[PDB]
């Protein structure tokens, strides 16, 4: 349009420098100097100019925290091969035993795709910053009648996180956080530098603080953030490290029944800004990545903490997302699937079933479509409970390689869709089974100190109803280190994860389900072959069949009755209860498996169910036949096999 | 006798659906150009519900009450209910009572009374920019954070306390003779 | 010359920044129209916040000397302190 | 709400020396600083330091430094300041307010205020 | 930085009583101030210029620009009878302090 001939003083030099426009401009699609140039107001005189300064917030000072960042992508090793996220097809990837990586230039493209405002000219940011348009993503939510919300908009290059609470009176305040690496941050509007601004500093990154002073009084109130701890974590850990802290917090705070009922604290504000950074932290590390290709097995790793945690926020708090799913990254992951058989996943290398769980979990958005993924899950559980030794409290890696594939067991029971009833169920069998006191205790102790012990358990999704908090302290570590009151109240946690009251815990997708006609009186159901079995303290259930168990006088009833084929009949049975026959006349010693398919659980007379367990391989009924679990020396005791032909007997004895 | 039985299998699923390589980055994305997200909160204003007010009578079941205090039944509704809920909650509950403001005597009565988890939702509010009073007039003093009319009371409570959220449910303080 | 600050872009044919120094603080810039020249006083920080931003936003497209050009703005910028104003006498131009 | 409760009031003679106590309720100590102001009678307000509860920093009036001292007690909530070599001078009513913050180049008011102290210097 | 306020000053009740301080480049300054009566410790009334905070009543306002802050009180009343005190923040050259101006005795006729 018109170039301008720039004149400045320089040390006493009378420099100048041509500006041109049209030749910027026609490379440069979206900058605009006359949209700009109103911003800059250059008319304004010293006063309108020095009452914008004395408005807005400064910060005391900076921490100046010095750190390391770690490394979170590799180098690309020899072997591996080179996709273009652009450019996926059928072709050139095969098995799960080929090493690759996926091209960072067309990921970032894809990840970012959307384009809109990223920092709007608003009350507390036109004084602030110019207007910026570009390409970006978002994590956004409101809460409490909308009279606050939250956003959580970040770039490929810095993050921006705003916090806003609207009063009865229509008054309301603005704060926003801005953070990411110090010589790419933003353009400030006027005379302003982020050292004034910035309360915390390292060697790339720095955390600043945008508000006015009048607000930012106000939020100091109830908001008060450990920046120091914050801003470390935001640049210590690694990406995926990063967002397991993230998510198990976030877990941990709704379990307890926290979202419920969103309280405007500290606490909870700042777990929204660091859901915020964990999204950002993923997908800085692909910018910073030199236009370079990043192994998959990371990015598996990466964008599988992030899909849990967008599906986990979306329901606590009801946020949403709009980015960061890259389709090419899915696409690829949903190929490699189709090369590999659901049901022989268990037989895979642990390394190489994790590597799948996360992939099929990410290639499968919300398990929208294909649920043979269920059977996946299953492959593996079944495979790692004929491994898994007689009521142990799991182990750190079990508890690993089960949490991830919990996840896409946790999307189908969402839907009471009847989808693969008998997959599912196998699943919350063996999880049942595997539900030891023992692990009630390690879960207790996890929960009371936030580790991976309380994150995850199988117990969450058993058949087991009859726990109450009586049942759970009794079961309770009992150690002089730990808080007992910090016990008892993970405990009122863990049954409130299990309450019927919950989704997950509608348990719909069982036909046999119907049979029940008081679900408060269930105490567990084990679905077998042809047969599910229910044990309720309930006379009337529509059953084929009714048992009841030998207990004492004040003791609650214990009956079970079979449902064939899992199709209820029009009502009880009629009349009273059957007895069943003992065995004395058996060996420990057995030639084969001949318990297999059934399953064997034992009660307390006074206590109700103690233990449950399956046989589902050789394996196992020689653990249990070898072992002293048939305690015929306590009187108080007593042990029962249920078999697929909805018959149980009693075991009297063992040579 | 005893047979041997097969080793426990997993049912058999379906192959995977096909993968829609002509599927674009538009019907992936539909809609580049896109816009943050904002929330318009809805605002109204509280006005006394001249449907209830002070009773004006005696009356007191001495196994209902909770606590007692000079000559006035004290109750905590057990039904929790919303701010607004509990004028009405105990108008319809019980014969003469209603929902009452703690004052600098009482308060310390019922605060001995409540544990350090739960909440009591109390007859307290706003009536212009201040003056905070109750049924019972006067004036209490409220400690003013979040601009909201509702109050409430715990264990740790020196005075009613405000709160960003009137919808949560607690107990409801009311009172009788 | 210093003045006192109290249009469109393609409307100013040469800009002219100064020192600190030159008006004692006051960061003054000077436009101007292209002969008859009609010359504007216009804020010397806003002018050079703006230039810096152009520079920035179009970093992928700028050569050598652009690029110099930007590090000597920053520099002048850091250079220019704010708060001195509130001792100043604000109208001393006027 | 916010407290502010003040004492350690008394009567003292030129050269001695006194301490004043104001104990924080209401609100979290470490979240808010200490500012501290001295009223004679028929006088104005003078500002005299102000401390951080939480970081031990402090900024003393000039005219004081040397002969005055801050300190807090964070387990208890509650804040000293020492005068030394009292004047009749000195005689006035000595405030305690919450001050949010105060730093090198920045600060903010005082929205709550204590009772006082009323201090008294004479031989 | 020392700040410039009247003595005091008495008006008729019911106007809009205003009281002013001066000082250089006063309007880039943040003013606060600050109400006080016999017996009582001072009462923070206005904030940042022109901000209150609740249990202030909607007949005190105030501004602040160039040489001169101004609080002002409509309809003034009989019970607004205090003392009144500018207070700023000044940077200290290093040496950063809060100052007060001499305060202004504000009364109401009748």
């Known amino acids: 349009l018109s170039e301008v001939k720039l004149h400045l003083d320089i040390e006493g030099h009378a420099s100048h420098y041509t500006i041109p426009w049209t030749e910027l401009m026609a490379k440069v699609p979206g900058l605009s100097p006359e949209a700009l140039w109103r911003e800059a107001n250059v008319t304004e005189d010293l006063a309108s100019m020095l009452n914008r300064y004395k408005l807005i917030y400064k910060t005391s000072g900076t921490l100046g925290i010095a750190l390391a960042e770690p490394v979170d992508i590799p180098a690309v090793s020899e072997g591996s091969m080179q996709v273009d996220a652009s450019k996926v097809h059928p072709g050139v990837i095969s098995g799960l035993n080929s090493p690759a990586c996926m091209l960072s230039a067309p990921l970032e493209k894809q990840l970012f795709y959307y384009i809109g405002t990223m920092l709007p000219n608003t009350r507390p940011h036109s004084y602030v910053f110019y207007q910026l348009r570009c390409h970006l993503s978002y994590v956004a939510l409101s809460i409490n009648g909308d009279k606050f919300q939250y956003t959580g908009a970040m770039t490929s290059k810095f993050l921006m996180g705003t916090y806003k609470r609207v009063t009865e009176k229509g008054d309301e305040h603005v704060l926003s956080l801005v953070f990411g690496k110090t010589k790419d941050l933003p353009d400030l509007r006027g005379p302003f530098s982020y050292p004034s601004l910035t309360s915390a500093q390292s060697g790339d990154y720095s955390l600043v603080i945008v508000t006015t002073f009048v607000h930012y009084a106000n939020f100091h109130n109830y908001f008060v953030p450990n920046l120091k701890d914050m801003f470390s974590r935001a640049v210590t850990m690694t990406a995926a490290s990063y967002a397991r802290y993230v998510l198990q917090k976030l877990v941990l705070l709704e379990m307890k029944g926290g979202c419920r009922e969103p309280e405007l604290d500290t606490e909870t504000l700042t777990t929204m800004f660091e859901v915020s950074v964990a999204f950002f932290k993923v997908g800085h590390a692909v910018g910073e990545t030199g236009n370079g290709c990043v192994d998959l097995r990371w990015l598996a790793k990466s964008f599988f903490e992030l899909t849990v945690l967008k599906d986990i926020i979306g329901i606590c708090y009801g946020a949403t997302v709009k980015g960061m799913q890259s389709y090419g990254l899915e696409r690829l992951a949903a190929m490699l699937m189709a090369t590999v058989k659901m049901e022989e996943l268990g037989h895979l290398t642990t390394e190489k079933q994790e590597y799948a769980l996360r992939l099929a979990t990410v290639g499968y958005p919300k398990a929208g479509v294909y649920s043979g993924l269920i059977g996946g899950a299953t492959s593996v559980l079944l495979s790692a409970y004929n491994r898994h030794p007689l009521f142990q409290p799991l182990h750190t890696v079990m508890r690993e390689t089960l949490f991830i594939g919990s996840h896409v067991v946790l999307r189908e029971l969402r839907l009471n869709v009847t989808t693969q009833g008998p997959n599912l169920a196998l699943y919350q069998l063996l999880s049942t089974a595997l539900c030891s006191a023992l692990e009630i205790g390690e879960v207790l102790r996890g929960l009371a100190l936030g580790t991976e012990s309380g994150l995850f358990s199988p117990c969450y999704l058993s058949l087991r109803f009859d726990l109450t908090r009586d049942k759970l302290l009794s079961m309770a570590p009992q150690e002089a280190t730990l808080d007992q009151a910090a016990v008892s109240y993970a405990v009122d946690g863990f049954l409130g994860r299990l309450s019927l009251e919950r989704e997950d815990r509608d348990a719909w997708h069982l036909p046999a389900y119907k049979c029940v006609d008081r679900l408060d009186k269930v105490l567990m159901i084990i679905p077998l072959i042809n047969v599910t079995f229910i044990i309720s303290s309930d006379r009337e259930v529509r059953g084929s069949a009714l048992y009841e168990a030998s207990t004492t006088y004040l003791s609650s009833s214990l009956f079970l009755s079979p449902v064939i084929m899992n199709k209820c009949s029009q009502g009880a049975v009629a009349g009273e209860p059957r007895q069943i026959p003992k065995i004395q006349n058996f060996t420990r010693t057995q030639k084969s498996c001949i318990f297999c398919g059934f399953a064997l659980l034992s009660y307390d007379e006074k206590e109700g169910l103690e233990t449950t367990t399956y046989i589902t391989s050789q394996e196992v009924q020689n653990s249990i036949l070898s072992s002293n679990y048939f305690d015929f020396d306590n009187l108080h005791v007593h042990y029962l096999l249920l078999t697929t032909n909805g018959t149980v007997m009693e075991i009297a004895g063992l040579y | 006798t005893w047979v041997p039985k097969p080793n426990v299998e997993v049912w058999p699923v379906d192959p995977p659906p096909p993968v829609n390589f002509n599927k674009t980055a538009e019907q992936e994305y539909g809609d580049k150009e896109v816009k943050l997200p904002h929330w318009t909160p809805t605002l109204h204003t509280f006005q006394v519900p001249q449907n209830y007010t002070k009773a004006n009578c005696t009356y007191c079941n001495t196994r209902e009450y909770t606590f007692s205090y000079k000559g006035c039944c004290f109750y905590f509704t057990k039904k929790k209910h919303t701010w607004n809920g509990c004028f009405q909650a105990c108008a319809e509950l019980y014969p003469c009572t209603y929902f009452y403001g703690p004052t600098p005597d009482i308060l310390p009565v019922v605060t001995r009374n409540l544990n350090a988890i739960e909440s009591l939702w109390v007859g307290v509010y706003r009536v212009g920019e201040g003056n905070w009073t109750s049924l019972d007039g006067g004036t209490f003093k409220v400690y003013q954070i979040f601009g909201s009319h509702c109050t409430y009371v715990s264990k740790f409570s020196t005075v009613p306390v405000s709160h960003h959220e009137c919808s949560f449910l607690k107990p409801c303080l009311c009172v009788s003779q | 010359p210093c003045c006192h600050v109290t249009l469109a872009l393609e409307n100013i044919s040469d800009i002219y920044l100064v020192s600190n120094q030159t008006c004692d603080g006051f960061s003054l810039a000077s436009l101007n129209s292209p002969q008859l020249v009609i010359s504007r006083c216009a804020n010397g920080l806003n002018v050079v916040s703006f230039f810096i931003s152009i520079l920035k936003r179009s970093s992928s497209a700028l050569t050598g000397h652009l690029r110099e050009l930007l590090t000597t703005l920053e520099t002048l910028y850091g250079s220019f302190s704010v708060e001195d104003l509130f001792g100043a006498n604000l109208n001393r131009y006027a | 709400q916010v407290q502010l409760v003040q004492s350690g009031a008394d009567v003292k003679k030129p050269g001695a020396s006194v301490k004043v106590s104001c104990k924080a309720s209401?609100?979290?100590?470490?979240?808010?600083?200490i500012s501290w102001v001295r009223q004679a009678p028929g006088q104005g307000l003078e500002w005299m330091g102000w401390?951080?509860?939480?970081?031990?920093?402090?900024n003393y009036a000039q005219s004081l430094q040397g002969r005055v001292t801050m300190t807090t007690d964070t387990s208890t909530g509650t804040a000293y300041m020492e005068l030394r070599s009292l004047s009749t001078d000195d005689t006035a009513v000595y405030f305690c307010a919450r001050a949010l913050e105060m730093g090198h180049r920045s600060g903010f008011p005082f929205d709550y205020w204590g009772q006082g102290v009323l201090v008294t210097v004479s031989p | 930085y020392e700040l410039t306020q009247p003595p005091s000053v008495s008006v008729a009740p019911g106007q809009r009583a205003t009281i002013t301080c001066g000082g250089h480049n006063i309007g880039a300054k943040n003013v606060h101030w600050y109400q006080q009566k016999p017996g009582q410790a001072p009462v923070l009334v206005i904030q940042?210029?022109?901000d209150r905070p609740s249990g202030i009543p909607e007949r005190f306002s105030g501004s602040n620009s160039g040489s001169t802050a101004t609080l002002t009180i409509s309809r003034v009343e009989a019970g607004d009878e205090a003392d009144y005190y500018c207070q700023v923040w000044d940077s200290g050259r290093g040496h950063p302090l809060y100052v007060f101006g001499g305060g202004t005795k504000v009364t109401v006729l009748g």
């Open positions: 940042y210029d022109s």
């Open positions: 209401g609100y979290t100590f470490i979240h808010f600083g």
């Open positions: 401390i951080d509860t939480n970081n031990g920093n402090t």
